Write a protein that binds this ligand. Structure first.
Ligand SMILES: [Fe+3]
Ligand SMILES: [Fe+3]
Lengths: 191, 191
């Protein structure tokens, strides 16, 4: 399989100010292109040469995993956002968040805390298991819930390249602002 | 002891453009300040409340280590640079680098490669053992060579906050430029 650099479903300046034009250009246009390019090179000659992306994340190790994990993480990341929304989840997912976390507000707070306290580079993920149970997963570096057999629903990138141009060291502020661009219709569809 | 935010031995704009004025403001002024403030609070009521930095780095774990390791790494990082220096190491260190790596140019290429291939946040360190044997250590996140009983001689920060404002994703270009601000008199003094 020759993995592709996903096409963004909105203009590069669509998520500003929370994710600026410049950040999208570097984050999607350079960092992700690199992860995709590296993944495609490393898998040739291995058992993952013709495997789907999810299988690679589930089974690979080392460099292949680092690039496969990052490719999947970013594909989910850029596709879950849209300008002018945010707000709150509804349907089956909104009801499940209320039941398991207490309320949407409490969920956001625990999620913000998980992302703020993750030391170094990584991702904070809302994931669901086979019985529909929700959990907040802290994933160092290239981690993704698919490695644990879980379904990734919403992931915030806390690698510094995701927010440094606009927020510098203010990661908690960036995380608080991200809720404003989450497209819950797309997230609910993942659940 | 009360751990201090280290006083810089030069003007805040002295390392520009390799480490710009704005980068020193955030990197030293915010990031390091946070590591030091957290270290001082976290050690209250622990076996480390009255230990020197080296001992905390050699024996702590968890959050105390994360902040103590980052404080030591940054104190060494900021104090090893100076404008109008750079060039090649001389004396004992210079000759040890030639003997172990063949030449200073080859050593820099190997050090640059280690810094470039370190996935995620971390440090690349030139360290020595009790008999002067040199090694290039890749330390993830808050890691420091004192943790394995070595002497930290030269360390480059590859956490993205160290270079993102000026270089964005061009980590390799940043690492090659750092050689130009290294004060070998100071590094030789550590050997
Ligand atoms: Fe990223
Ligand atoms: Fe740093």
């Amino acid at each position: 399989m020759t993995h592709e650099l996903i096409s963004l479903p909105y203009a590069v300046d669509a998520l500003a100010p929370v994710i600026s034009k410049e950040t999208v250009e570097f984050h999607h246009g350079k960092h992700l292109k690199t992860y995709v390019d590296n993944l495609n090179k490393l898998i040739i000659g291995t058992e993952f040469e013709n495997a789907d992306l999810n299988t690679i994340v589930q089974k690979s190790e080392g460099g292949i995993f680092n690039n496969a994990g990052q490719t999947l993480n970013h594909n989910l990341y850029f596709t879950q956002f849209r300008p002018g929304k945010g707000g709150a989840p509804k349907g089956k997912l909104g009801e499940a968040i209320d039941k398991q976390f207490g309320s949407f507000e409490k969920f956001k707070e625990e999620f913000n805390t998980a992302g703020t306290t993750l030391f170094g580079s990584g991702w904070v993920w809302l994931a669901s298991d086979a019985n529909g149970k929700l959990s907040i997963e802290k994933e160092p570096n290239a981690g993704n819930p698919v490695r644990k057999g879980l379904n990734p629903l919403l992931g915030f990138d806390v690698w510094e390249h995701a927010y440094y141009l606009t927020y510098q060291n203010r990661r908690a502020d960036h995380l608080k602002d991200l809720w404003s661009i989450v497209d819950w219709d797309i997230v609910e569809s993942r659940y």
